[PDB]
């Protein structure tokens, strides 16, 4: 049928530009044949298909490739990601809803929907009458909406009794103070 | 490979036959932009970013031309081994919490796409939708397959039910992923 070629570059940053690693993958259909890994220092053949390339590239393009760690990776991070990606702050919306139709003294589940936030770092906690809940809290993975915002659902297994106050507590870099939402039976 | 951030400056994919190519920049897993090979422009997902940073599309075109070049060479090298078709798997979920009458967006996340050719469409009450639909470029996966997301703006109601239709060469028939509010 068809044939595919993929070229996938990766600039891995740690502690800002304190540690930058550059990995470049050359792939045929779904087989990576030759890879440049700055931790290694030169191109390498992953499979036989890469020998015709590794050999030659280490002679004519080694230094040019290594320099991209500064000319591309570091440059982009400091001059373009800095004023955009790294400055993006989107506050989470938090709302609680009950899974099953209410009936006091009957087991149920509270759902805290924390949505539309960026970046991914976030802390979501459940409290019942001022005490933090742990064992009965469950969560989805961090969901990437694909539009530069995430969402996550944190559930609390509970039994609504009169006078109780259930609080979903969210902490995020875009927030000076935590966002809390209460639900009373 | 762990790190605080990851920038993929210049993911370049080319496919034959058909002369299908894609050039994108991803940061921390999100799409910074893709270069429209035909219009020859850099299309930013977040339009505001194009005000603080810029990319010359030529770099995109050039990298694609090279992708094309390396495809012939590699196709010959494998003795014309064709790409295996995979079965894409779709998942539908709402962007925001579902509330009768409150505008929302349904998201169709399609994973394990290979090769990078697909049709992702929406059906509302079993009929095709045109308006309110947007789609991302293909995102790379650790196993070299791709994922893509489609978006449908909608208002949750009692009568409307939905389907994300996925049509791919690795699927005998278009698959429907059903979703309806509560």
């Amino acid at each position: 049928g068809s044939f595919v070629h993929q070229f996938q570059p990766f600039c891995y940053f740690t502690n800002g530009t304190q540690r930058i690693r550059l990995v470049i993958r050359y792939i045929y259909n779904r087989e990576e044949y030759v890879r440049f890994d700055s931790d290694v220092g030169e191109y390498r053949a992953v499979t036989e298909l890469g020998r015709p390339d590794a050999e030659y590239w280490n002679k004519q393009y080694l230094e040019r490739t290594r320099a991209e760690l500064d000319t591309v990776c570091r440059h982009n991070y400091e001059k373009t990601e800095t004023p955009t990606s790294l400055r993006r702050l989107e506050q989470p919306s938090v709302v609680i809803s009950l899974s099953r139709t209410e009936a006091l003294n009957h087991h149920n589940t509270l759902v805290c929907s924390v949505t539309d936030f960026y970046p991914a770092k976030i802390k979501v906690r459940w409290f019942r009458n001022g005490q933090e809940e742990t064992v009965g809290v469950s969560s989805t993975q961090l969901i990437r909406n694909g539009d530069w915002t995430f969402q996550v659902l944190v559930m609390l297994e509970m039994t609504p009794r009169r006078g109780e106050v259930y609080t979903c507590h969210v902490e995020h870099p875009s927030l000076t103070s935590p966002i809390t939402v209460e639900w009373r039976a | 490979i762990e790190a605080d951030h990851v920038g993929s400056y210049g993911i370049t994919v080319y496919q034959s036959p058909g002369d299908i190519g894609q050039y994108t920049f991803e940061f921390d897993g999100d799409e910074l932009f893709y270069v429209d090979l035909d219009k020859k422009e850099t299309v930013w997902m977040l339009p505001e970013f194009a005000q603080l940073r810029r990319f010359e599309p030529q770099g995109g075109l050039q990298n694609i031309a090279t992708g094309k070049h390396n495809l012939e060479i590699l196709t010959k090298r494998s003795n014309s081994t064709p790409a295996t078709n995979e079965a894409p798997q779709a998942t539908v979920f709402p962007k925001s919490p579902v509330l009768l009458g409150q505008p929302n967006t349904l998201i169709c996340f399609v994973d394990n796409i290979f090769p990078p050719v697909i049709n992702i469409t929406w059906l509302r009450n079993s009929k095709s939708v045109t308006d309110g639909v947007y789609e991302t470029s293909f995102f790379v996966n650790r196993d070299y397959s791709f994922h893509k997301l489609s978006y449908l703006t909608f208002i949750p109601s009692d009568d409307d039910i939905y389907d994300c239709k996925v049509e791919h060469w690795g699927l005998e028939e278009p698959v429907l992923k059903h979703w309806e509010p509560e």
Binding site: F7, P9, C11, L22, I24, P52, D53, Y56, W57, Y61, R64, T65, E68, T71, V72, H75, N76, K79, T80, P83 | Y9, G10, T12, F25, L52, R53, R54, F55, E56, G59, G60, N63, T66, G67, H69, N70, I73, L74
Partner: peptide
């Protein structure tokens, strides 16, 4: 500022 892309190298015919 301007973004720079990582260069893809052309294999030999």
């Amino acid at each position: 500022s301007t973004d720079y892309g990582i260069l893809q190298i052309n294999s030999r015919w």
